[PDB]
């Protein structure tokens, strides 16, 4: 039996909750804001030096009209992440409300507060005005630059397991099979690659 943990992800719209989870899932960076409806549950597995641990992330909706049954999604939650946008003070002003709603249901669960979009230079919320609970923890993160994007899961893992020296470790890379295709199907993928070669890469004009 594997070790699982229910993690609820809350925060205002456009803060980057879904972008963050997708980054962890596929390594992609979603540029569009596609508002989450109700909740979406995504499993995240991390390999640690104390074995693999799975996070069942309940990605909740931040807009009230799309909220569905939010407070119900917190039931039986074992940890949580609250996110906001450091370029938007309103998203930080509502952090105490998200924290309140969470504790009302889950009481003393470990929670991580994440100030996202620190890659944007016109920062309005400074980390000094945040920094102190034992179950609270703060990280600057950036889903776009990946800055500290592993720390919320690493800290939560350490707390839930009770091991301050828990480390993420390299994922085993088992020997891959060589796949042989008929020259016909190889050509069909060679054509598809040609078509793809006409579309540009998403970060072509970023800092890089």
């Amino acid at each position: 039996p594997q070790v699982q943990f229910k993690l609820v992800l809350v925060g205002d719209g456009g803060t980057g909750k879904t972008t963050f989870v997708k980054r962890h899932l596929t390594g992609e960076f979603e540029k569009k804001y596609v508002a989450t409806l109700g909740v979406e549950v995504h499993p995240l597995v991390f390999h640690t030096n104390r074995g693999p641990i799975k996070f069942n992330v309940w990605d909740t909706a931040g807009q009230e009209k799309f909220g569905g049954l939010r407070d119900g999604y917190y039931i039986q939650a074992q940890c949580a992440i609250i996110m906001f946008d450091v370029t938007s003070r309103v998203t930080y002003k509502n952090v105490p409300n998200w924290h309140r709603d969470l504790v009302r249901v889950c009481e003393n669960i470990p929670i991580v507060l994440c100030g996202n979009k620190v890659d944007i230079k016109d920062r309005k919320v400074k980390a000094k005005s945040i920094v102190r609970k034992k179950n609270l923890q703060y990280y600057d993160i950036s889903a776009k630059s990946n800055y500290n994007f592993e720390k919320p899961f690493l800290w939560l893992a350490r707390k839930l397991i009770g091991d301050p020296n828990l480390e993420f470790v390299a994922m085993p890379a088992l020997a891959p099979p060589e796949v042989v295709m008929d020259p016909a199907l190889a050509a069909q993928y060679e054509h598809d690659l040609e078509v793809a070669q006409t579309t540009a890469l998403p970060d072509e004009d970023d800092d890089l």
Binding site: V3, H24, T26, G27, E28, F29, F46, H47, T48, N49, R50, G51, N146, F149, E150, I161, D163, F168, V169, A170, M171, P172, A173, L174, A175, P176, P177, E178, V179, A186, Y189, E190, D192, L193, A196, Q197, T198, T199, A200, L201, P202, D203, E204, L208
Partner: protein
Amino acid sequence: PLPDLVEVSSGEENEQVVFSHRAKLYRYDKDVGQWKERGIGDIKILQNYDNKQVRIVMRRDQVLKLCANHRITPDMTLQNMKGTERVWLWTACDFADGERKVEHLAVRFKLQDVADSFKKIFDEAKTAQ
């Protein structure tokens, strides 16, 4: 209760690293017709000592998860992206997600001599098999 410690086996113990450098990997999504960022980390060309077989392996920074694990065959070739430089495209049968997925991949390098070095080692190793 959790195993007090777990020894990690990379699966690369019987292989030689003939290339290793930091890079950015992209994967094309046929459904939406876009390239998507796939990972950032050290992309590695590995050759097995005994059977001389070659594969590409890549793990992502910080999370340390795989974003590439696929064999290189003598038939495979690296294409250039017309409008972009220091970037190599190729098609592979990847198992990073523990499943066979045919994927059109692109790798981006900061420096040209690293890209040229990656093309050189790619073509040497695939034929040496």
